[PDB]
Amino acid sequence: LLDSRFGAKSISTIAESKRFPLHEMRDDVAFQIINDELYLDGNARQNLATFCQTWDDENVHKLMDLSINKNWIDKEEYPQSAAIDLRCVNMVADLWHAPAPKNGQAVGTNTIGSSEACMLGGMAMKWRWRKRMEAAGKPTDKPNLVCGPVQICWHKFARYWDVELREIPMRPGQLFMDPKRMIEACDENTIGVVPTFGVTYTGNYEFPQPLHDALDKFQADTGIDIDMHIDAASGGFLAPFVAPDIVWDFRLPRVKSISASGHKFGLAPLGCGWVIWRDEEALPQELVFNVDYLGGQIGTFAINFSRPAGQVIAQYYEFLRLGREGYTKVQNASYQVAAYLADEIAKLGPYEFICTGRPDEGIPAVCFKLKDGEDPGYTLYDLSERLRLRGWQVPAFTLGGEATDIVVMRIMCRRGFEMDFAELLLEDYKASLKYLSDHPKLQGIAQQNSFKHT
Amino acid sequence: KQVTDLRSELLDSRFGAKSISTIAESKRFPLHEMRDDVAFQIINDELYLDGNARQNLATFCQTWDDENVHKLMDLSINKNWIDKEEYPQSAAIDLRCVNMVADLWHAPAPKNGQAVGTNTIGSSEACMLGGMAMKWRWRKRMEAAGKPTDKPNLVCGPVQICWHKFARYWDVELREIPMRPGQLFMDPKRMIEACDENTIGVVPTFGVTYTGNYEFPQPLHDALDKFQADTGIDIDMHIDAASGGFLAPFVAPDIVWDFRLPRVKSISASGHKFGLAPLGCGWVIWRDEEALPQELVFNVDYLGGQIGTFAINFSRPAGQVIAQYYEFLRLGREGYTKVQNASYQVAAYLADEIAKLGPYEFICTGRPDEGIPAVCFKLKDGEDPGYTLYDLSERLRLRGWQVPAFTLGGEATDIVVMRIMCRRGFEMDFAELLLEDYKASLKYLSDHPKLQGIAQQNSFKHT
Amino acid sequence: LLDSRFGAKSISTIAESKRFPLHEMRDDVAFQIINDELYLDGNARQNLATFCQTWDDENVHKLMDLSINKNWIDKEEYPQSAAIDLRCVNMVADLWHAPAPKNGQAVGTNTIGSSEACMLGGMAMKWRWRKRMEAAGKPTDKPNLVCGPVQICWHKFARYWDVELREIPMRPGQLFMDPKRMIEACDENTIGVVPTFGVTYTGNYEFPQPLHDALDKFQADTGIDIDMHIDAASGGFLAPFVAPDIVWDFRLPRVKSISASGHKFGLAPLGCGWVIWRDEEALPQELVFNVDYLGGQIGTFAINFSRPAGQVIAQYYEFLRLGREGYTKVQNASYQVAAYLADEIAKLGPYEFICTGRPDEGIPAVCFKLKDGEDPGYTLYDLSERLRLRGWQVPAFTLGGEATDIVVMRIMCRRGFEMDFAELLLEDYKASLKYLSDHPKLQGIAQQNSFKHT
Amino acid sequence: LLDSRFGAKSISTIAESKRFPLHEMRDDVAFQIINDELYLDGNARQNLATFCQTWDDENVHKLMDLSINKNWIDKEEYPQSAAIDLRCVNMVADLWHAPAPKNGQAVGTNTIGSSEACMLGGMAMKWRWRKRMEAAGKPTDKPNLVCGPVQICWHKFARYWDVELREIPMRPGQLFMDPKRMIEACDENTIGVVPTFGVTYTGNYEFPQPLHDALDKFQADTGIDIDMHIDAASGGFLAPFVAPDIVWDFRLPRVKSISASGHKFGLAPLGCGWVIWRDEEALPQELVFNVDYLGGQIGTFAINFSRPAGQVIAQYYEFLRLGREGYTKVQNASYQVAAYLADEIAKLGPYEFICTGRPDEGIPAVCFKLKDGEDPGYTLYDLSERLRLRGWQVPAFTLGGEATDIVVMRIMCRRGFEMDFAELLLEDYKASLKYLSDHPKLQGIAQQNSFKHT
Ligand SMILES: Cc1ncc(COP(=O)(O)O)c(C)c1O
Ligand SMILES: Cc1ncc(COP(=O)(O)O)c(C)c1O
Numbered sequence A, C, D: 001l002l003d004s005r006f007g008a009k010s011i012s013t014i015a016e017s018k019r020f021p022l023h024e025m026r027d028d029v030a031f032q033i034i035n036d037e038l039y040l041d042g043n044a045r046q047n048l049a050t051f052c053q054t055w056d057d058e059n060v061h062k063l064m065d066l067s068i069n070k071n072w073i074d075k076e077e078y079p080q081s082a083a084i085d086l087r088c089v090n091m092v093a094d095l096w097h098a099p100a101p102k103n104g105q106a107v108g109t110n111t112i113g114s115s116e117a118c119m120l121g122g123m124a125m126k127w128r129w130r131k132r133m134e135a136a137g138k139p140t141d142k143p144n145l146v147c148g149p150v151q152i153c154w155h156k157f158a159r160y161w162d163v164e165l166r167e168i169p170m171r172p173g174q175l176f177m178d179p180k181r182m183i184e185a186c187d188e189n190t191i192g193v194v195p196t197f198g199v200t201y202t203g204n205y206e207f208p209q210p211l212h213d214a215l216d217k218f219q220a221d222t223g224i225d226i227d228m229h230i231d232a233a234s235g236g237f238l239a240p241f242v243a244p245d246i247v248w249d250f251r252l253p254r255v256k257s258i259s260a261s262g263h264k265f266g267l268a269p270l271g272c273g274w275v276i277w278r279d280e281e282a283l284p285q286e287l288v289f290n291v292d293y294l295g296g297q298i299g300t301f302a303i304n305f306s307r308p309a310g311q312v313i314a315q316y317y318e319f320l321r322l323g324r325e326g327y328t329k330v331q332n333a334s335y336q337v338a339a340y341l342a343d344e345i346a347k348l349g350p351y352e353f354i355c356t357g358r359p360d361e362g363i364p365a366v367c368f369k370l371k372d373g374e375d376p377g378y379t380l381y382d383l384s385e386r387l388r389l390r391g392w393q394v395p396a397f398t399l400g401g402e403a404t405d406i407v408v409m410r411i412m413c414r415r416g417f418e419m420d421f422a423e424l425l426l427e428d429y430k431a432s433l434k435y436l437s438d439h440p441k442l443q444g445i446a447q448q449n450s451f452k453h454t
Numbered sequence B: 001k002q003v004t005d006l007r008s009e010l011l012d013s014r015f016g017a018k019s020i021s022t023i024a025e026s027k028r029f030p031l032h033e034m035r036d037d038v039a040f041q042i043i044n045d046e047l048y049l050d051g052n053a054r055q056n057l058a059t060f061c062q063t064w065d066d067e068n069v070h071k072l073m074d075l076s077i078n079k080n081w082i083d084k085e086e087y088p089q090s091a092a093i094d095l096r097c098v099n100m101v102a103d104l105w106h107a108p109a110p111k112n113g114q115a116v117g118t119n120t121i122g123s124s125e126a127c128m129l130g131g132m133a134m135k136w137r138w139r140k141r142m143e144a145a146g147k148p149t150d151k152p153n154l155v156c157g158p159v160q161i162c163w164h165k166f167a168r169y170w171d172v173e174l175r176e177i178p179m180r181p182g183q184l185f186m187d188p189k190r191m192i193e194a195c196d197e198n199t200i201g202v203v204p205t206f207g208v209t210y211t212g213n214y215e216f217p218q219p220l221h222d223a224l225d226k227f228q229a230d231t232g233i234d235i236d237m238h239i240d241a242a243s244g245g246f247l248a249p250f251v252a253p254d255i256v257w258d259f260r261l262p263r264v265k266s267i268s269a270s271g272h273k274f275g276l277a278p279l280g281c282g283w284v285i286w287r288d289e290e291a292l293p294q295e296l297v298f299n300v301d302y303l304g305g306q307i308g309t310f311a312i313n314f315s316r317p318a319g320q321v322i323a324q325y326y327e328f329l330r331l332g333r334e335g336y337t338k339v340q341n342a343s344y345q346v347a348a349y350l351a352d353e354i355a356k357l358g359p360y361e362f363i364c365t366g367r368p369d370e371g372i373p374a375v376c377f378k379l380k381d382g383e384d385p386g387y388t389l390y391d392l393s394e395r396l397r398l399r400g401w402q403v404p405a406f407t408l409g410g411e412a413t414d415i416v417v418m419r420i421m422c423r424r425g426f427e428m429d430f431a432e433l434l435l436e437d438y439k440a441s442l443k444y445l446s447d448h449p450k451l452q453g454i455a456q457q458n459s460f461k462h463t
C-alpha cells in the first residue's frame, strides 16, 4: 500500500488508531496528513445554527499566533497579558453598570466560556444563600434554583452541585419565565433566580425588570430575600449597544452577578467568557484562592488554571478597535439582516414567528414554526434537509415542556453573515419550497433534531 | 489655552499621529472606533512587555515553538470542540487521542471499541471530572447500602491547588497528609490513618508539583487491599498524573502506577505539560463504563444521533487536541522516549553539577525512576553558605533566569527549596549557561555579604 | 546525549566551539539551533540606554529583506539603489542648509554609522589643515583637535590618525565645551573644532553659534583661521524639525562638514550614517577615489567598500512617508515623553537635572544626579539594579574630567517608547524606591557602570 | 497628473528629489513606490563580474530579518549575538592555523568587509613597524608598504594613513609580485609586505611561501626583519578546503595577520569581513579600545561602531550547516564550473589564459586575453557587449602597469552559478561569436571598461 501524496509506503491514521503510535514519522508528513483530513470539517460560513464567531480577521490570527504559549494563570511571566485581562474585566463591568470599585478594580474574571462563568456565578449564589440560612439557623439541606428555558450548562450546574433545578416549563402562549410562575416556584430554599437574557432556543430576552419587581413584592410579603444572576451569554454584548434603555444589568439591586460569552456577540475567538459580580460582598471570599507571585498574591476564582491568554488579548483588540461606537454599528448590521430575513420569510409560508430579530425583543435571530392546523406540504425538518443540499445548516428542532410538540426553525445572524448572503439564503429557501412542492413524497420523512445548544 | 485636563492629547511617535492611551481610559469601555491596524500595533507593542519564558525554569507548560504547531493552531482558531456536527474530523481526531492515551495507560480493552475518557482544557478540569465521578461512585455505594452520604472526605498528599478547589467547590473534606522533614509525601501508613467509610477515594500525585517526585501508587494500593481485608471498606484511587502521565510510560514502563492496578478507576494528565501539546490541553481516562456514573454524562442531540459529554466547559477551540494528535503521530513511543530522556539528561546533569557548588540536600535529582525532569534542593540544615536560596534566585533573575525559591507546606513550612524544571527546549547548552550564571551569582553573593537575607518573597510555584 | 527538540543525538554549539566544524548538519536543524539561542538576546523594548532604532515596522522589514543582496558599492548592477542614495544625500544636505550645488549634487556620502562619517569628516579636516600649513612651510606632524565630551569614535580618530585630542574636561557647572576654554586650547596646529550637537553622556547640545563667534574673534586677533565639523549624531535629525531657529548647521560659515546617524533619530535601521560637506572646496579631492563603470566613473570617499544598500533604502522610505511634517510630529512625541518623565521623576527624590528633554536644550533624554550632600538612602546604581529586576535597563554611570565623582542616570526616549510605557516606568520607579526604603542594606552595593557609549 | 497604480493624483520621486520632502505620505504608498522602482535594479544572477554572494537561502533571509535591530557593538543587550561572534572569530582563526590562544580566545574581529579588515591589519602593521624603528633609534617618517596588484582598499589605506605604496607593476610575463621584485622594493622603512591570496583582477594566487623564503634571506643578509599581512579576501575561504597543502597562512612565522571576506566565498550575506592576528603580540594594544559594560569590559579594534549583527549570525549558520565537509563540496562545485568554462571557451577562439579555475592556482575564475598578434574579428569589449544583450555581465577591462595594453575578460563562478547555467553561457557565447562574424562593422566600437573592483 502506497500513498499518492508522498508517493511512499502508506501511513494510515484510521489503522492502529486504537493504540498509541509505536514509531516516529517525518514531521511534515504528519502535518500534511492531519491538514488534509481537517478539510472534512465544515467552515461554518453557511452554518446558521451557531452563535460562536466564525468570521476571519487577519489581526486576530496574528494576536492568537503570538499568544499560543502565553499562560493566562502565570501572572509572573506574562505581566502584560495579565494587565490586559484586568482592563477587560473593568470594561465589561463598566458596560454592565457595575458599581464603581472601592479599590479601583472590578470584581470578576475571564473564563473559557459562559459555561464556566455560569458555574462560578452559580456557586457564589449557593454560598451567599448558605451563609444566610445558617445565620437564620435554618437547614441548607435542599437548595433550589428557579429559571426559565435555560441552556444545558445550568442543568449541569444543578446536577454537579446538587441543587434542585426548578425550570418553569415552556408552554404554548408562554414559552418563557414570567413573574407569576417564577414566584410560584420560589421559597426559602431558592438560592436565586436565573433569567436568560437571550434564550438559546429562540433568541428572545427574558426581561429581568418585571421579575425584579415581583421579587421585591415577594420579600415584602414573605421576608424572603431572593437575588438574581443574569445569564447574558448572548445579550450581554448586544443590548448595551443597540438598546441601552432596557434595564437588565447591575442597575437592578438584586442582580448580584452577570455572565456572557466573548466568543459569541462579544466578537472574540472561541474560548472566551466573562462573569462580573456587583461588588466584593457579592462574591464569598471562601471561593477565592490566593496564590503567591513575586509581586504579591492574587485571588482567583476559576475552574480552569493554565490556559492560553490569546482570546483575552483578541477580546481586548475588539474592544479597542470598536468601542461603543463600533459595536453599535456591528450589532445593528446583524439586526438588519435578521429583521430582513424575518420579513422576507414571512411571505413564503404559513408561519408564526417567535423571534423576528428586533433589538428590543432579543438577539439577531429569526425563530418560527408552522401555524397551528396548517399544512403547507412539508415540515420544517424537510425544509431544513433541502437547505443542507444547498450547503446551509438551518436547524429545525422541537421545544420543551408543554410545547414538546412544537417544531421550530431558528436562524442565527452573526458577524460575517451579511445582507448579500441573506439574499442567497432566500433564493435557496424559495428553491427548496418549489422542490418540496414538486416532490410531495418528501413530506414527513426527515425527523431528526439538529444541534441546538450552541 | 487648551487646558491639559480637557484633552485626549498626547502625540504618538509610532503613528506620527496622536492620542490613544490604553492606560488613561482603561477603566471604562472605549467610546470610539480606532483603525484596526493601529489597535493591532498598540496591542502588539505592549505584548513585548511579556516574557518569552525561554529562561523561565519554573513552569511545566510548553514554551518551545514548532512551526507546524503554529500552522495547525492557526487553521483551528474557529473549530469548535463541542460542535461534532460541523467539525466531524476534529471530533474523530479527538476520539483517537482518547483511545491512544487510554492505551498508553493500560486501560482495559473497550467493550465497544471506544475508551471512556475526554479531553479537557487542562489538568484542573480533568481532576474535577475525576473527583466528581469518585464522589458519585462513593455516594451510590453508600446509598445502595442505606448509609448517610453527607460527610465525604478525600485522602491525598501534597496536591496541587486544583484539589483544594475541588474539595471547596464540591464540599468534600480534604484530608491532606502533611509534608514533613523526613517524609514529604503520602506514605501507606499515614494514608491508612486518614481513611474511613466516608473516604470517597485516594489521590496519589504522580509527579508532585512542588518537588517533582512521584508518589508511587503500588505500595498505597497494597495498603488499601489490606485495608479492605481488615475492615471491608473498599477504597479506590484517582491518579493525578498531570506531569508523570506522559513520562513514565516512555522512560520507566516498569513502574506500576496506572490501570494495571485494579483500584485505579481514573487517571488525569496535562497535554500542555510533558504531553508536549500547546497550552489548553488536558486528559482524563476512566477504567471502563462502570467507573463513570452515567448520571454525570449529558447526551445532546446531533443530526447524526446523540453524543454524551462530561465536561465543565462547553464551546472552546479544538486546535490543541489537533496539535496533541500531531505530537502523537510524529513521535510515537519511540519519539517520546527520546524527547523525555533528553530532558532527564539535562536535569540529572544540573543536579550533579549544582551539588558541587554548595552545601545542599537534594529532594529530587531528575532520575526517571524517582520522578519528573526536575531538580529540587534546599540548603543543608544548620548550614549557612552566606546566602539564602531567595537571594540566589534574585541574582539569577538579574541574569534573565527565573528559578523559583519557595517554602514547603505542612510542618515543613520552615523549608526553603529551589526547584528547576527541565522541559522541551531547555537543552544541554542552555543548562551550561545556567551553570555559568549560577557560579557568577555565587561569587557576587560572596563578594557582597550584605545581600544575605534581604530577599524573602516566594516565587509562583503552582505551575 | 539527546536533544528534546529534534528527538535525536544531541548537537552542541559549545563542545567544539573553538574549532571550525568538521561535518555538515541539516540546514533546518542548524537554523532552529541558532534561532533558539537568539532568544537569549533582549529585544531592547525596555532598554532605555540606547539611541538606536528598536521599533519594528513591517514595511522596513520588507525593504530590508528585498535588499539583502543589493551591493551599495556596485552602482553598475544596482543603479536604482545608487540613485536613491544620491537623493538621500541631497535631502540631508538640504535639511542642514548646505549651499546649493554647482553641478546639482550635494557633496556627501552615506556611511555605516556616525563613526565612519566622523572619520571621513576628521580626515578631510586634517587634509585641509595640512594643505594650509604646508604652503607656509610649517611642520605638519603635530596636529591637534579641539572638542568637548566627545563620543569614543573621536578618541579612535585621534589615535588612528595621530592627532592630539584636546578634549575640554567635563567639570561641575561646566560639563561642556564653552567658548573660553575652547579658545584656550586652539593654536596654529588645531585642525578644527568639533562641537557635539547632542552629547552622548547627557543629551545636551553644545551650541556651535557662540563657539563660531569666538572663532571669528580668534582669527581677528591672531590670523589663525579655524573651521568646525559638527558631530550631530543625534541632533542632526532633531533640531531641523523641532527647533529650526537654532543656528548650528551650514548657515554658519565655518561649519565645513556635518555628520549624523540615520539609525538614531534619523529613524533608519541599524547600519546607516551620513556626512555632508559644505561644497567641493570643503572636501580635498586627494581623499576621493574614482572607480570606472560601464556608464562612466564615479568617485567615492569611504572607508568601507562592499556592503548592503537596504538601510539607505529604508532611510529613504522614512524620508518619503514622513517629510518635515511627519518628522516634526514623531520627534515632538519623544520630547513630550522625555519632558513628562523629567517632571515626574523630579517629584520622587533629591535630584539635580542636567537634561530635562527640552527641544531647545538638546535631545529627547533625561539626565540627572543626586543633589550634592543628599542621602536618599540609595545610589543611582542601586536604583538601576532594582529597575533591571523589573525588566528595565536605565543606565547609571559616572561622568569624566573633574566630575569624576558624579554619578548620573540617563534615560533615552526613542520611537516606540510612548507615553503609556513611560507611565509604567514611573510605576516601577516608585516601586523600586519603596523597596530600597524597606531594605536599607541594599545601599552602596551596586557599583558597576552600564554601557553608555550608544 | 495621475498614477495608474494608485488611481489618484501622482506622487513623483523625481520632482523635488533634491529637497527634503515637506509633507507626509501614506506608508503603503511610499513602500509601493520604492518597491516598484527597485525593480530597475538587476538581480545579479547573470552578473559574472562580482565575488559577492547573490544566491538566496530562505534560512539566511529569516536570520537576517530577526537580526535587523541587533546591535553588534552592544554586547550588553545582545549577549548571544556577541557570543556567536566570538565563536566565529575562533573558528576562522582555527581555519587559518593560528597559534592556540594563551587564554581561550583568538585575536581578531569581525568587520563590515575586507576593506575595514585590511585597514585594521594595515594600521597594526604600521604600529608594529613604528615601535621597532623607535627601539632602534631610527626615524619613522617615511613608511612604505610593498605589494602586488592589490585591490583599491590598499590604495586607500596608503593614502589615508600616509604610507608610500610600493606596488610591483603588472607586466607581460610577470603580472604578479615575485620574490625578486619584492626584495628590490624592500628596505628599513617597509612596514610589511601584502601578498594578495586571490588577485581581484585575474583570480590567481600570489603564493606567500616563496615570498616568505626571500624575506628570511633578506633578514639574514641585512638584519631587516619584515612581516606579512595576507589579503585573502577570496582565497581565505577556498584553499583551506580545496587545497590544504598550500602553505599561505599562520603556518608561516612572518604572517602576522590575515583578512578575508565572509560575503565572498565565506558564503555570508553582504556586510561581513574577518581579520585575525597571530597572537596578542601581533596586535599593538594602543589600537584597542576598552569600553565598559555591566558584564565588565570588552576590547575592540574597529573603525565602525554600531551596526547590524545579522551577517555574523548568518555566517555562523553557514559554518554550522556546512563545516569543512560542506565547504569543500560547495567550493569544489564552483571550481568544476570554472574549469569547464575555461576548457570550453579555449576551443572558441585564439585566447591566452591567465587563470583557468584550477584549485592549486587560485579562485574559481576564468581570465583570458586574445593572443598577441591575433585578430579574430572582434575585441573582448565587443564580445562583452553582445553578451549583455543576452542578459550576461561578463567584464572586459585592461590590466595595470605596462599591461595597460592588456585587455582581459574575467568570469567569476560563485555559489548559484551551476553547470547548467554555464552551459547556457556557452550557448550565448557561441551565438555572440557568430553574430560578430556576420556583422564585422561591430569590431572596435565598444571601448569602456566594466566595473572590476568586486
Ligand atoms: C444562554 C446560554 N448560556 C450558556 C451557553 C454556553 O456558553 P459557552 O458554550 O460559551 O460555554 C450558551 C450557548 C447559551 O446560549
Ligand atoms: C499535579 C498537578 N495537578 C494539576 C495541575 C493543574 O494543571 P493545569 O494548570 O493544566 O490545570 C498541576 C500544574 C499539577 O502540577
Ligand SMILES: Cc1ncc(COP(=O)(O)O)c(C)c1O
Residues within 6 Å of the ligand: C051, C112, C113, C114, C115, C116, C151, C153, C196, C198, C199, C200, C231, C232, C233, C234, C261, C273, C453, C454, D304, D305, D306, D307
Ligand atoms: C555624539 C555621538 N557620536 C558618534 C556616535 C557613534 O555613532 P555610530 O554608533 O552610529 O557609529 C554616537 C553614538 C554618539 O552619541
Ligand SMILES: Cc1ncc(COP(=O)(O)O)c(C)c1O
Residues within 6 Å of the ligand: C304, C305, C306, C307, D051, D112, D113, D114, D115, D116, D150, D151, D153, D196, D198, D199, D200, D231, D232, D233, D234, D261, D273, D453, D454
Ligand atoms: C583582494 C581584495 N581585497 C579587498 C576587497 C574589498 O573587500 P570588501 O568589498 O568586502 O571591502 C576585494 C573585493 C578584493 O578582491
